[PDB]
Amino acid sequence: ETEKLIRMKDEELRRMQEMLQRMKQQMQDQ
Amino acid sequence: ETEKLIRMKDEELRRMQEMLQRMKQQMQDQ
């Protein structure tokens, strides 16, 4: 549980930072 | 200190989501 929870939230943080970088690259195209 | 980490990563997830919706409203301005 608690270890699995930490690993789940670490994966989500990675996904959201990846999504931030894609939105960053899309707003530079303007 | 697993419970302190879970709260830290929950705080990070919240800030990155505010930032994503903040970047979203900036791309809706284009």
Curated annotation (Swiss-Prot), chains A, B:
Organism superkingdom: Eukaryota
Coiled-coil regions, chain positions: 1-30
Tissue: Expressed at high levels in the CNS, as well as in heart and platelets (at protein level).
Subcellular location: Cytoplasm; Cytoplasm, Cytoskeleton
Function of the protein: Filament-forming cytoskeletal GTPase. May play a role in cytokinesis (Potential). May play a role in platelet secretion.
Remarks, miscellaneous: In a heterologous system, SEPTIN5 overexpression has been shown to exert dopamine-dependent neurotoxicity. As wild-type PRKN, but not familial-linked PRKN mutants, ubiquitinates mouse SEPTIN5 and promotes its degradation, it has been suggested that a deficiency in SEPTIN5 degradation may contribute to the development of early onset Parkinson disease 2 (PARK2).
Entry protein name: Septin-5
Organism whose genome encodes this protein: Homo sapiens
Gene of this entry: SEPTIN5
Residues of the whole record sequence present: 340 to 369 of 369
